[PDB]
């Protein structure tokens, strides 16, 4: 009932939504978004975005085994990776101030702060507050109203 382009645009919108409830301890001039691992719904992200506060979002794909993901991005959009790959990615991110969002929402027990459910009439997400607490970034609770819109 929804196309791939509709879903990708909806993913772009919900990510901008979520970013607006987030604060980094050192706010960059340009927000760095990294798309990591195989994705279906990231093509919109990768054209680049502008936040409502004026700040540009620069998007690139990076490799799962890049050891510096944690210093190269403010945000990671994580695709459909293996358990070994997922462990690799979060080991690299640990202790760095990074917002993590997964495309798929089957495994939100550990790792990503937000896990999207994109198939269906609207995008929803789960939020893992333990992952948020460990993230090094501030996330306001009212971000949770985006999942119900």
């Amino acid at each position: 009932r929804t196309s791939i382009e509709q879903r990708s645009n909806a993913v772009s919108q919900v990510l901008l939504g979520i970013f607006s409830y987030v604060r980094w301890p050192k706010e960059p001039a340009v927000l760095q978004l990294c798309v990591v691992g195989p994705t279906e719904y990231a093509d919109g992200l990768l054209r680049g975005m502008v936040q409502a506060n004026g700040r540009r979002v620069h998007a690139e794909r990076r490799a799962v085994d890049n050891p510096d993901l944690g210093t190269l991005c403010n945000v990671i959009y994580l695709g459909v990776v293996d358990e070994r790959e997922r462990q690799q990615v979060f080991r690299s991110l640990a202790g760095h101030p990074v917002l993590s969002i997964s495309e798929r929402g089957t495994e939100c027990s550990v790792g990503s702060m937000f896990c999207l459910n994109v198939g269906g009439p609207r995008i929803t997400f789960e939020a893992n507050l333990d992952s948020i607490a460990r993230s090094g970034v501030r996330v306001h609770p009212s971000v949770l109203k985006l999942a119900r819109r």
Partner: protein
């Protein structure tokens, strides 16, 4: 849309001090953990969330079966606090994962300590 840019200094309850950690072999919440939890519960109810999944965990010390049950007790202690804060009982799912999903390195005291936790998950 992007209404979060309107937010000023009020209600930032999900920071570094909002992890829910436990002592070695303990399944009871200390006074400050109860406090954090009541505040998290209040924050969630303030944004119209009254449904939650609570996932308990252990470090990898000892028997796997014992640890599975300890992880359930930890999630149960958290559930009781959400109920006393006013969250409806039927809307709180409890789950124990035992030792199987660590967040931190089990080979250090500090890492094992980060693993003895309950993760509050907010579903769609």
């Amino acid at each position: 849309q992007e209404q979060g840019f309107e937010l000023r200094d009020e209600g930032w309850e999900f920071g570094m001090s909002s992890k829910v950690l436990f002592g070695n072999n303990l399944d009871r919440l200390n006074p400050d953990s109860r406090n954090t939890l009541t505040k998290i519960a209040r924050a969630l109810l303030a944004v119209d969330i009254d449904k939650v999944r609570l996932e308990g965990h252990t470090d990898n010390y000892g028997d796997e079966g014992y640890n599975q049950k300890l992880s359930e007790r930890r999630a149960e202690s958290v559930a009781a606090v959400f109920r006393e804060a006013g969250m409806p009982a039927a809307n709180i799912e409890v789950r124990g994962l035992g030792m199987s999903k660590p967040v931190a390195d089990n080979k250090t005291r500090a890492g094992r300590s980060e693993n003895r936790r309950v993760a509050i998950i907010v579903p769609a």
